[PDB]
UniProtKB/Swiss-Prot annotation, chains A, B, C:
Disruption phenotype: Double lpp-ompA mutants are spherical and only grow in the presence of electrolytes such as 30 mM Mg(2+), and are sensitive to hydrophobic antibiotics and detergents. The peptidoglycan layer is no longer attached to the cell outer membrane which undergoes abundant blebbing.
Whole-protein coverage range: 22 to 77 of 78
Location relative to the cell: Cell outer membrane; Secreted, Cell wall
Organism classification: Bacteria, Pseudomonadati, Pseudomonadota, Gammaproteobacteria, Enterobacterales
Species annotation: Escherichia coli (strain K12)
Key words, A-Z: Cell outer membrane, Cell wall, Coiled coil, Formylation, Lipoprotein, Membrane, Palmitate, Peptidoglycan-anchor, Repeat, Secreted, Signal
Record gene name: lpp
Self-association and partners: Homotrimer. Interacts with OmpA. Has been isolated from outer membrane preparations as an approximately 87 kDa complex, suggesting it also forms larger complexes. Seems to interact with TolB, Pal and TonB. In pull-down experiments interacts with CedA.
Homology family: Belongs to the Lpp family.
Protein name as annotated: Major outer membrane lipoprotein Lpp
Record-level GO BP terms: lipid modification; periplasmic space organization
Amino acid sequence: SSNAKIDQLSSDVQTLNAKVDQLSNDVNAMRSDVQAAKDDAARANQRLDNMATKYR
Amino acid sequence: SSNAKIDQLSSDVQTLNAKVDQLSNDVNAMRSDVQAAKDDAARANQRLDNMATKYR
Amino acid sequence: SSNAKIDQLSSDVQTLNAKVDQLSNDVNAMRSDVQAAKDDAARANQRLDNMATKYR
């Protein structure tokens, strides 16, 4: 356009929009990993609970 | 204003500011979940340590 | 510059670029913690597997 500054800003904003959307995906993807960890930990403790009344 | 392009950029920047602030909350919230997982895992291993000198 | 609005937008975009880059670091840093949790959980369950054929 007739304004180089505006053109650069527009480009940077488009890039930011994408970077933000990507970080959103990254965060959401990490959620499944956190739940996986949390679930495996509960699984370990559950197993221990299942034998704690038998072994001390 | 007299510049439609600037108005659109301003709006997009305001939205980005909010989206970034939100992602910040999401990340911080996930921290408590990660620590919860990490703590429950250590708890399982601690329990195992407490009986490992008794059972092999 | 001759446009206060553009100057403010430019500043805000620079700040956003930094905030986004930082969130990227925060997310990446959290990854090592999630893996740590996941690994310690697997470690607990592995230990349990190692004695499950001996104790029920």
